[PDB]
Amino acid sequence: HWGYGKHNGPEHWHKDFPIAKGERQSPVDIDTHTAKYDPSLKPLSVSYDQATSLRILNNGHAFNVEFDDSQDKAVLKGGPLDGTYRLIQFHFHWGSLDGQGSEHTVDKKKYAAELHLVHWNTKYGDFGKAVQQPDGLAVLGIFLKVGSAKPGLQKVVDVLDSIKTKGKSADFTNFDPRGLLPESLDYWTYPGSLTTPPLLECVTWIVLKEPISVSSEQVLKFRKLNFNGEGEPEELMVDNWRPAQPLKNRQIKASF
Ligand SMILES: [Zn+2]
User: Fold this and answer.
1) Cα(64) to centroid of ligand 1, in Å?
2) Is 1 a catalytic residue?
3) Annotated binding residue at 195?
4) Does 33 appear as a known binding residue?
5) After which residues is the backbone of the chain broken at C–N > 2.5 Å?
6) Per annotation, catalytic residue among 1, 12, 33, 61
7) How do 36-37 and 253-254 pair as beta strands?
8) E strands within the chain?
């Protein structure tokens, strides 16, 4: 029964998920003056040309676009990663207002939203096993600012009417996640966690330096979703972000 409200939100999560207070929790503030350039990091390899989207679901926390991860169709490798990580889903975190919504911050700056492309280490055979390993996941984080429309996001925005409430899903085939990427693959990377319960410390975070621009109308449509199920009182799905967690004993490395 975790959520983002006064009574079940991030300040409460540690009671059911004591790892909430652990040594590698996400997200974090990225202090751009403290992050060290690591000239030994490889270019990120994003290979999404055979990505097969299945469906889009409102899970009462965000909406997830799910992919067929039964072969190496859409993979992330290189950068800080050893081996091959398979895309399983993406989702976003967003605000009630354009001045908040992102989970990661950059020199304490909050973006309007953050996209998370979730990938799992193929050496662990399935997603559920991967989340129990310290190198099990690679999450590609992309900031969203409000400006010009992102044409490659509009197919997502258009289906949100059909999944307004918790538990609603829709067919979402032939969606090309390449249309969500900025021009530059320059990134920061650090070891961290899932930013929602169960907050497992299984994530290599790769956060892109260059945000994508979306329109105010595109972000407004995210804000019209519901955390509640059909027939329950309307709670708008806004402010579904975890605030920045203590960096503790961690170095953020820059690719640039
Ligand atoms: Zn996320």
Assistant:
1) 10
2) no
3) yes
4) no
5) none
6) 61
7) parallel
8) 29-30, 36-37, 44-47, 53-58, 63-67, 75-78, 85-94, 105-106, 113-121, 137-146, 169-171, 187-192, 203-208, 212-214, 253-254
